[PDB]
Amino acid sequence: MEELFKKHKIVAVLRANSVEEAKEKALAVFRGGVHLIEITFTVPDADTVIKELSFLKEKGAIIGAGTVTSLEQCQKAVESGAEFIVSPHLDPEISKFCKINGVFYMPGVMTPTELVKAMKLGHTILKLFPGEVVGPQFVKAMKGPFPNVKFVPTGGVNDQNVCEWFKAGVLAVGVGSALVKGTPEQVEMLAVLFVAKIAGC
């Protein structure tokens, strides 16, 4: 898949409060041109949102599950039909779980050691959480000792610095409130205003 992150270059870290609220915001983001949608599991009954957005896999969208803390949460995520699993932390149980079911897993990392342990588990594509603390100097510092790790930061990505991240060497970026905050038509506009800003650096 990996290429699918270098193609679309942006992931919608979608958090919501209800199941109907979440279906709206994903539809708006997809109309805005963003095809990687990460449905966080802090949304109540997110294992049903991902199976209820299954028609967008025909329209060309990659719907996945994000912020996954337990591997038994990962069961409901795989069985729902998610196409990638995202977690803010490195949990080797979930990595075994995802390798063996055949699902892409993106672990949460913040330190060099946290990255090496995630590398020994086979991963070369990590989430860098929270990006508003490590910063693009981190990504540019890991370019040397670990020339294989590709990063997808989350939290700390807005259109004032979205080119800073990329011109340091990230694979894609995840945007939370600065893409989903707003009316289900405002959200579509925020996506095209963000997918265009990216296409410039």
Binding site: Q186, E188, M189, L190, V192, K197, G200
Partner: protein
Amino acid sequence: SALAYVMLGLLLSLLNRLSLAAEAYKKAIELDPNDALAWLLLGSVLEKLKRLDEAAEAYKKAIELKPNDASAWKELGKVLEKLGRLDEAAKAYAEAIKLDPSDAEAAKELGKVLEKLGQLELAERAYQLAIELDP
């Protein structure tokens, strides 16, 4: 002949004889209902004749034919902004940026439509996209 009437309409457009040029394009559309060039030209002629309601219709018929002119979507934004459908125009300026995110004009003019529609945040993000492009 389908081409020749378009060429006549362009020549009449050069002499400011605008309404006569619109007559020429329309005869080129009877000749070939799919000459999307004659459609796009007719829209920009009516926009100056200020037949803005009939103008947006021809622009829509042009976008229907060749769905990916950032020229055509940006030009339908001018007509729908003047006509008053300020949200139908922001959706059109959006499609134009979905097609060329280097269009400095279409980004500037989307932030102006949004500044009047309410969302200063959405507009301020668009304004800075345009300033980012051209010097």
